[PDB]
């Protein structure tokens, strides 16, 4: 794909492969979060669906990056996908906190790649990230922050009851 | 606009300009209330929307007054709009209380203008206020009183939980 | 909102609050322009509507900035809104000139904020301004320049007649 | 989930987790196959789509297994996902051969799990595999065998031309 | 148009005029490619249409640049349009290669203009190019690379036959 | 294309290539006229659109000639396209006069080609020109003459006002 490649550095090509791995890892983590909340002894369907939807969103992000890698003439390379950091995810506020930490990590990775593209004068890359990822992240993180505030306000009053109310009336 | 002006005193013309300023100040206050409840660390969307809707209603009131000023041949004159009295608005009951205080202030201003128009035998003014403002205020104040009673009943039981329930099930 | 805030400088947060104030001031100015042209002794309905529509557009810009401030985890802070620079706005060309001066001032403010965001490596901010504001301004300024040329061409021939024709056939 | 678990052995629970890992690994492999054929220097869109569709099918299989794990009261546990066995996948017949090897491996895993469930008198497990997986595999393997025969017949005549014809007229 | 011009350098204004010339030259080249493939002794209608469609796309790009030149207050200036580099365009792979060379030249010109706008802190220009041109080019170049790979694979097997198949089944 | 060519002289083939160049030059001129009237300091949208529509009509004429060249078995050959005769086009009557001069030049070229075809007993050529070009030109020139008369009548009364009225009420 040296035939189409233009203004696409090796540094960016590698960073894009790393970012694909991070998005796939995030999707895997959300798959685990979703099925945890689907357990009969956890049983919060709104939370299960929230995280399962996010697994799909992160996979879609990876696929968009891969499509872009090929559009630019870079070579997609896949690495092992490490398993999620936990096997069990605690309460709703525990899970939402872990999700915010995860999204901030992806966001920082996006910002770092943007900074690299800017240094290398790669405006297509910079536009691609801004158009498809940066605002998606900002909106998602705001939503999770809103959720966490509501969950914390609820479980501060009464833990079990608050978790049920949030799952029923928000999610 | 001396060409159309009839039975429209300078006192009423000035009072109408003052009232426009008060309605615009009220709209600004509601804009601030709305965005406060939109913060990720407050996060009560029903409350945000309630106040944002009221910002629009107050602006519309100002515009109606301005249209009327011109219909009567008076000259619209604008003054600085002072910023809202608070930067942060506390809890839902705090905000609803501030809103009731605000509306009673507008209502008193409307009543004072009505009394002026009555003293000056300006029935068009008196009809205009009765038809477009006085009942709107009475209905709004009743609604906010109903809200405050419900919020107080809820937060008296359990603060955080009560605020969430009200935002979800009333607003 | 330290819980969601990431890569969002205090300098940008403050500049966004200042920009909200500028957009609200612009909206207020357009409200005054609109009602001036609605006076029975000015009476150019197309001009009144043109400026009233712009009052709405500027308010919407402010609201978008406020939404963004919260999305990023900054704190919206409101200041007094100074009244418009004039109480009376002269002829159509006078008003259109004042409008172009106003828009160039907002545009420069947008460019200054963009430069700040670029210096601080805040690509979300830069994208936000480019996507929602920069082109809107360029298009609006071009439209007002087209208008001013047409108005000037018309009032150069015959003042009163030219103003009427422009209001009727362009606006 | 000891509260719902009945006739569900630890051996089957573990084997189901292993099978989830195998289906996710297969999905990952198909993702890599799909993006390989999407490269500008490979450029067989029908082949890209064939494998991308299979990535989705394998992920869906994993999700069904996970849903079943929870339905039975077992605990879903995730392991690292090893990267695909190749970074580049050769020609269409090379890729289809690798795909048949992959599917036979999944099929054997399904048969082994079925044999385990049969030995443990777990008819729900046995029915689940028969209803959702065993025939899906048989049909898919038959389709890939049909494909490979056609591809081999074509590239035996003329390699490049044959690959293009197959991608255009079959896929 | 000194009346609307703001933050728009003479360097960018001139570069935009040069870019218009390049897009018009590209459109002219594609017109020639299209009519070459329409000759009764070449006779590849899918190839004719592919290039005629691109002539239209390049002309549209020029028109968008011209519209933008005026929106910014610059002065559109036209230069002679040099004729295409060839009178006859060889085989399908010859033509597709020439097309890729042409598009890479336009792309480099776009990147050079973007770099200029970035150096001059002209974010409207940079956004304009990113939004309307940079990705269009990346997508087009990827498509042409995919085409060239397929054509080369086909004519490597059997020249005449391969050209016919590609025109029929891809274009 | 000696395989299809019949009764098609080298003189006509060359003249057709020259005519294509003239139509493309005319289209380029109209592109320049259109964007001139789109400038913020000229700003006559009806005039801009009138000339932009004519740019399209002339390009379409060129394309029809090229299609015909190939239908007859001649070889399309392209030459440089000289830039338009002016960078700035004055007032509406100035531009309409230049347009009439341009169209009369194309018309004379069409008549000269018709005379050549008649001398060479090429009835297909003669029919082609009569059916697709000669009446189109006569109708267009009549329309431009009608326009010029109206514009001249208007600007004779009052220049600026007259130009605005014509753009608004005719174009």
From Swiss-Prot, chains A, B, C, D, E, F:
A GO-annotated cellular component: cytoplasmic vesicle
A GO molecular-function descriptor: ferrous iron binding
Binding site for Fe cation: 53, 56-57, 60, 63
UniProt-listed CDD domains: Ferritin
Subcellular location: Cytoplasmic vesicle, Autophagosome; Cytoplasm; Autolysosome
Primary site of residence: cytoplasm
Stretch forming the signal peptide: none
A GO BP entry: intracellular iron ion homeostasis
Function: Stores iron in a soluble, non-toxic, readily available form. Important for iron homeostasis. Iron is taken up in the ferrous form and deposited as ferric hydroxides after oxidation. Also plays a role in delivery of iron to cells. Mediates iron uptake in capsule cells of the developing kidney. Delivery to lysosomes by the cargo receptor NCOA4 for autophagic degradation and release or iron.
Subunit comment: Oligomer of 24 subunits. There are two types of subunits: L (light) chain and H (heavy) chain. The major chain can be light or heavy, depending on the species and tissue type. The functional molecule forms a roughly spherical shell with a diameter of 12 nm and contains a central cavity into which the insoluble mineral iron core is deposited. Interacts with NCOA4.
Misc note: In horse spleen the light chain is the major chain.
Name of the protein in its database record: Ferritin light chain
Species whose genome carries this gene: Equus caballus (Horse)
């Amino acid at each position: 794909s040296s035939q189409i490649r233009q203004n696409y550095s090796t540094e960016v090509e590698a960073a894009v492969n790393r970012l694909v791995n991070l998005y796939l890892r995030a999707s895997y983590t959300y798959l685990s979060l979703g099925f945890y909340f689907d357990r009969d002894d956890v049983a919060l369907e709104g939370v299960c669906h929230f995280f399962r939807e996010l697994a799909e969103e992160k996979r879609e992000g990876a696929e968009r990056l891969l499509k872009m890698q090929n559009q630019r003439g870079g070579r997609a390379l896949f690495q092992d996908l490490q398993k999620p950091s936990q096997d069990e995810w605690g309460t709703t506020p525990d899970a939402m906190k872990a999700a915010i930490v995860l999204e901030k990590s992806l966001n920082q990775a996006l910002l770092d790649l943007h900074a690299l593209g800017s240094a290398q004068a790669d405006p297509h890359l910079c536009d691609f990230l801004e158009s498809h990822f940066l605002d998606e992240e900002v909106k998602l993180i705001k939503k999770m922050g809103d959720h966490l505030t509501n969950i914390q306000r609820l479980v501060g009053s009464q833990a079990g009851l608050g978790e049920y109310l949030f799952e029923r009336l928000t999610l």
